[PDB]
Amino acid sequence: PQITLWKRPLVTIKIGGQLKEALLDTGADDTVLEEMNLPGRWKPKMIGGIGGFIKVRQYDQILIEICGHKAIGTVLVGPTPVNIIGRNLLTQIGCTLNF
Amino acid sequence: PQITLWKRPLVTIKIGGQLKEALLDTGADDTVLEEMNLPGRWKPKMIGGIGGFIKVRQYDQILIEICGHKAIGTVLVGPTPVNIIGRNLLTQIGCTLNF
Numbered sequence A, B: 001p002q003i004t005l006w007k008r009p010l011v012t013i014k015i016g017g018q019l020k021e022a023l024l025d026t027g028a029d030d031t032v033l034e035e036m037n038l039p040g041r042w043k044p045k046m047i048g049g050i051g052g053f054i055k056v057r058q059y060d061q062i063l064i065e066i067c068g069h070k071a072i073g074t075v076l077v078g079p080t081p082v083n084i085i086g087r088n089l090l091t092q093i094g095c096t097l098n099f
């Protein structure tokens, strides 16, 4: 689809068999989701944002369906203010910016 | 034009007679620019993201040119690592997400 930006670009995602709302975020290198239970092993990681760094759990090769489009990639889980879909997954679904 | 998301979507902007590089950020409600001594009145504000909140100076009705497309709106100035073009200006240049 084509998504305008008058409102936040929120979409429904499916991860770990659960539906959630997430923000399509071209300013994010990586995908960061709010605290959640995901199966498989994970590595502690740190990522920095506008207000400093947070500790996240890194899950690799995780399936996630974004607005009907499948992706398999790295998902960071931690105390983010909102679920954000970053460029590592936006590229997988073929998302571009156009003006 | 169309911008893929393999790399950060960095473009040249023009503000107050000055060229700068800025990130087209669909995840940013507002526009946040590196410390700059813009003229005129302003209002203190705090914006939050990953890591917490930062203090910024809100300037209103500021003209910015983004890839030859003009836009006028609120700009937040503060200690941000990168110039961030948010939805308040992206809408004015006709920017959409497409997949």
Ligand SMILES: CCOP(=O)(COc1ccc(C[C@H](NC(=O)O[C@H]2CO[C@H]3OCC[C@H]32)[C@H](O)CN(C[C@@H](C)CC)S(=O)(=O)c2ccc(OC)cc2)cc1)OCC
Binding pocket: A023, A025, A026, A027, A028, A029, A030, A031, A032, A047, A048, A049, A050, A051, A052, A053, A081, A082, A084, A086, B025, B026, B027, B028, B029, B030, B031, B032, B047, B048, B049, B050, B081, B082, B084, B086
């Ligand atoms: C050289 C030093 O760089 P640093 O690492 C940090 O540099 C960056 C800092 C921020 C960004 C942009 C933000 N991206 C981000 O957080 O992405 C994380 C995950 O993926 C990584 O990739 C880049 C960073 C990591 C995001 O797009 C937009 N944000 C809101 C999101 C969170 C939804 C609520 S918001 O900016 O906070 C913001 C809030 C309110 C506003 O208006 C009211 C306007 C903007 C990109 C690079 O330094 C560490 C101290």
